[PDB]
Design a protein around this ligand. Structure first.
Ligand SMILES: [Mg+2]
Ligand SMILES: [Mg+2]
Ligand SMILES: [Mg+2]
Ligand SMILES: [Mg+2]
Ligand SMILES: [Mg+2]
Ligand SMILES: [Mg+2]
Ligand SMILES: [Mg+2]
Ligand SMILES: [Mg+2]
Ligand SMILES: [Mg+2]
Ligand SMILES: [Mg+2]
Ligand SMILES: [Mg+2]
Ligand SMILES: [Mg+2]
Ligand SMILES: [Mg+2]
Ligand SMILES: [Mg+2]
Ligand SMILES: [Mg+2]
Ligand SMILES: [Mg+2]
Ligand SMILES: [Mg+2]
Ligand SMILES: [Mg+2]
Ligand SMILES: [Mg+2]
Ligand SMILES: [Mg+2]
Ligand SMILES: [Mg+2]
Ligand SMILES: [Mg+2]
Ligand SMILES: [Mg+2]
Ligand SMILES: [Mg+2]
Ligand SMILES: [Mg+2]
Ligand SMILES: [Mg+2]
Ligand SMILES: [Mg+2]
Ligand SMILES: [Mg+2]
Ligand SMILES: [Mg+2]
Ligand SMILES: [Mg+2]
Ligand SMILES: [Mg+2]
Ligand SMILES: [Mg+2]
Ligand SMILES: [Mg+2]
Ligand SMILES: [Mg+2]
Ligand SMILES: [Mg+2]
Ligand SMILES: [Mg+2]
Ligand SMILES: [Mg+2]
Ligand SMILES: [Mg+2]
Ligand SMILES: [Mg+2]
Ligand SMILES: [Mg+2]
Ligand SMILES: [Mg+2]
Ligand SMILES: [Mg+2]
Ligand SMILES: [Mg+2]
Ligand SMILES: [Mg+2]
Ligand SMILES: [Mg+2]
Lengths: 77, 76, 52, 51, 64
RNA sequence: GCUUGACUGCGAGCGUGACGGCGCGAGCAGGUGCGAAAGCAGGUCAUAGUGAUCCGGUGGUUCUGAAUGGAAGGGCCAUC
RNA sequence: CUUUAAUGUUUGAUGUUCUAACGUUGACCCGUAAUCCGGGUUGCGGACAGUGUCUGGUGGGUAGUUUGACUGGGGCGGUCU
RNA sequence: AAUUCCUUGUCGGGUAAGUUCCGACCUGCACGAAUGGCGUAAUGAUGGCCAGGCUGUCUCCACCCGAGACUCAGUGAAAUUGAACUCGCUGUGAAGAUGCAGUGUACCCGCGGCAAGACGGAAAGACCCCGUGAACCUUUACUAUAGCUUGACACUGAACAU
RNA sequence: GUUUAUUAAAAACACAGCACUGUGCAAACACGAAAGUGGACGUAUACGGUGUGACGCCUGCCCGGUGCCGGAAGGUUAAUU
RNA sequence: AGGACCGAACCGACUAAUGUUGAAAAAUUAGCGGAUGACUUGUGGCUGGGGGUGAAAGGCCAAUCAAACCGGGAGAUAGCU
RNA sequence: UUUUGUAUAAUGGGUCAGCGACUUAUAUUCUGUAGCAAGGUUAACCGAAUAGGGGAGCCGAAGGGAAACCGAGUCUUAACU
RNA sequence: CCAUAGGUUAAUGAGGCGAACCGGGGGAACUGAAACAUCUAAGUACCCCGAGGAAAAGAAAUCAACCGAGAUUCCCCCAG
């Protein structure tokens, strides 16, 4: 499903407004993108489904550090 | 049709009759045009409404060349 | 209705004003009148202004 | 005890009259209803503040 | 449950010493210029609630 | 002819409305105008020329100001 | 200042030459007894396409509703202060 | 004219007599060319009209054969029903009377029949109206919205040319 | 030939044919939040949609309105800055 | 050769009568149409309710269809009787 | 039963028996009644516990004003006889 | 090419059921507004996930107001 593998962002629901404030249910989905991240330690490319906000934290945190937290959650690669 | 229109009645006429005791400021008659004219101790409003300027009995009388009807207050 | 309402502002600077109407086709000149000002408790000249 | 025979004086209508809102089950208008007009506590303007 | 006061009526009526309710006069919002000064002056002071509407006001204001 | 009473604060007592309300008002206070004065003037001979509340706008205001000083905002007055 | 021309300074607009993101419902290899999927090799495309947020337009495609009363029945006409 | 209101248009044909049919007229109230026009063999439980044959369709019904209806034995319902000692007439009367008034008539009770009435039975009227009822459907009704489309930003980086 | 099973079988629908239009194949389109599937294991001599309705003779005039298509100079105009 | 002809099975259901507390909650009798085909039929399978399916009648989707049935919101609401 | 009006040929009922419709909770106002009284009364809770404790609070004895404020006065107004 | 993916064993653990209560992911409409859009109904009904005997919450980047209080939960007031 539409879940970020780094930040865990998932679709959320809200209202479409209008000039008359009429509220209709809607969904907000993350800006998810499938990217192949280069992991130096394994000298390999690993593909992750990440949001655009997740991409920013990867540079700040390091490719190895983020993957270590994901392994704590536990998943396939 | 193009008719069938009217306005609410404004309740004109004599409110206090001859010999009635009235308080100062009480209107005696509401009218259109000077059917009655103000006499002694009687005021005239901007719409020719006659009001009492003193406490006393209402008296109607006819005097003058025009054979008009006048309202006066005898303040005892 | 084409006559438009105007305000007459006192010259004393109290900020009190009266309101009235005036004909725009004629009498272009501003309206000046001596009217009582409750703030100064005196009759002063009131000057035409714009309602806003 | 209404609606318990002729002799009781409140039978066959329960004191509710004849086929009005008050005679309906759960019937009756809300507080302040003036027949359709906006009620007096809405014809008049708000004033003041709470200190 | 506790009775809920009509909040719209609570912002326009205040209880007086003898149990009455005072309200401000209407007709003095935005067409007042064409009204004579005497008319505006009489509408400025506070007014008493009429006897016919006393029952309706008390129903809307059960806690005051 | 001269003028702005088409005045400000009020108002005894009445009228008419179920009510909201509408209408009339001597007189009082402060300041005016016209008269030599008595006096008259709170618009127009009178009765049509009009629209409640909410919301928002403008001016004024030592009323309020969520720790305190302000302020925002609100209130009041004028007014759209 | 106008008509402007050149000159210095800034965002963009297309076009192109790229590949490295991204795309490949091109080829080949492997997982593999597999027209799926994944990985690899290669070709092509390529900072587009495509998607997310925001935003303008369009939208009976699909919804929720409105569409007054009086009235010699109703509608039509007329009327509403 | 599957279209013509006036209208049974007018003329002709058909009939003893044709508001239909067929042929024309054009005055097309208010035909008309792919929301197709005009024709068209064949086809049609297709629509209209005519003729022959044929006949109880009818003039005008008669008889006969069966199955019911009728009687006996056995078994044995139903809809409906405020209660009935449940006549006619005229008048009255939620304004069309078995029940009121007046008056007339009528011994008590079955069976076979007919349906004039009991505003007969059936089903809280489908027409009409109303409710600030319901639902579907339409659209340049309102307010939205899926979808489609536009641009900015992100995914998305580096040279060159104008 | 088909149709209102249970009051309507028709002049209605379908029909072969005709024309317009969309669609270059990761096709348009449709079903699916998506993946995907149908279209089609087809490729414009194909497919979808629309109207007309064998055949015969033919199908005239209007692009103002409403749509659609093409253009983009100017006017106006969102998010953003 | 033929969505050819006549005509049984088979399938349809045009007319009339009966029946309408039916023999039968749609049939029977006498006629009627198709009857090698766009036929008919058996056994399985698939499409699900604002959806399906429909040679299109708002038809059909378990004797129910201008939005199936069952349960729930729910003692909806009902200025009406 | 519903109506201006029903023997009405307006609705209802074949009959009997059983069942079948103004309740409950909370708050508020008014009346009656009882207690205390310028005071009245506790709630949760404690508690061998329908007692007692708990006065946290609530209403009343002072109002006027939008409010600040003032106060048997107060507001309105420059000021009110 | 190492590797990695993958593959074969062996150990543990989980699968389902069950009334309500609880947390979380989704989430109506009828209705009320005497219509109806904001609003109400209602984060209710319902669906889904998970846990326990309770769950959840919980040890101040909290309140107060220049005095102070000192986690969370629950009850009565404050207060319609
Ligand atoms: Mg009685
Ligand atoms: Mg009644
Ligand atoms: Mg004059
Ligand atoms: Mg609704
Ligand atoms: Mg009407
Ligand atoms: Mg004709
Ligand atoms: Mg002839
Ligand atoms: Mg002919
Ligand atoms: Mg035509
Ligand atoms: Mg055409
Ligand atoms: Mg024929
Ligand atoms: Mg013959
Ligand atoms: Mg016989
Ligand atoms: Mg029986
Ligand atoms: Mg009888
Ligand atoms: Mg009779
Ligand atoms: Mg008999
Ligand atoms: Mg008979
Ligand atoms: Mg109506
Ligand atoms: Mg049928
Ligand atoms: Mg038929
Ligand atoms: Mg056709
Ligand atoms: Mg053109
Ligand atoms: Mg055009
Ligand atoms: Mg054949
Ligand atoms: Mg044949
Ligand atoms: Mg059939
Ligand atoms: Mg019959
Ligand atoms: Mg049966
Ligand atoms: Mg045959
Ligand atoms: Mg259908
Ligand atoms: Mg139809
Ligand atoms: Mg059916
Ligand atoms: Mg529906
Ligand atoms: Mg159900
Ligand atoms: Mg409910
Ligand atoms: Mg019910
Ligand atoms: Mg009867
Ligand atoms: Mg009956
Ligand atoms: Mg008592
Ligand atoms: Mg105790
Ligand atoms: Mg205390
Ligand atoms: Mg006083
Ligand atoms: Mg409503
Ligand atoms: Mg346990």
């Amino acid at each position: 499903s539409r879940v970020c593998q780094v930040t865990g962002k998932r679709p959320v629901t809200g209202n479409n407004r209008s000039h008359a404030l009429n509220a209709t249910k809607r969904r907000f989905l993350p800006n998810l993108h499938s990217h192949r991240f280069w992991v130096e330690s394994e000298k390999r490319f690993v593909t992750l489904r990440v949001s655009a906000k997740g991409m920013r934290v990867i540079d700040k945190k390091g490719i190895d550090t983020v993957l270590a937290e994901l392994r704590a959650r536990g998943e396939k690669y | 049709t193009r008719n069938g229109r009217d306005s609410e009645a404004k309740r004109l006429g004599v409110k206090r009759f001859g010999g009635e005791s009235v308080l100062a400021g009480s209107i005696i008659v509401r009218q259109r045009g000077t059917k009655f004219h103000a006499g002694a101790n009687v005021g005239c409003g901007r719409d020719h409404t006659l009001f009492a300027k003193a406490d006393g009995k209402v008296k109607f009388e006819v005097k003058g060349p025009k054979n008009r009807k006048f309202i006066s207050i005898e303040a005892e | 209705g084409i006559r438009e309402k105007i305000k007459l502002v006192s010259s004393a600077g109290t900020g009190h004003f009266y309101t009235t109407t005036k004909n725009k086709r004629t009498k272009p000149e501003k309206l000046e009148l001596k009217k009582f000002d409750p703030v100064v408790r005196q009759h002063v000249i009131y000057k035409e202004a714009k309602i806003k | 005890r209404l609606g318990r025979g002729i002799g009781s004086g409140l039978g066959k209508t329960g004191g509710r009259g004849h086929k009005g809102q008050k005679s309906r089950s759960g019937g009756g208008v809300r507080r302040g209803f003036e027949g359709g007009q906006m009620p007096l506590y809405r014809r008049l303007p708000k004033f003041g503040f709470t200190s | 449950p506790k009775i809920k006061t009509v909040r719209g009526a609570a912002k326009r009526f205040k209880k007086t010493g003898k149990g009455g309710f005072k309200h401000k006069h209407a007709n003095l919002r935005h067409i007042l210029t064409k009204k004579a000064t005497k008319r505006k002056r009489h509408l400025r002071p506070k007014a008493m609630v009429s006897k016919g509407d006393l029952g309706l006001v008390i129903a809307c204001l059960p806690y005051a």
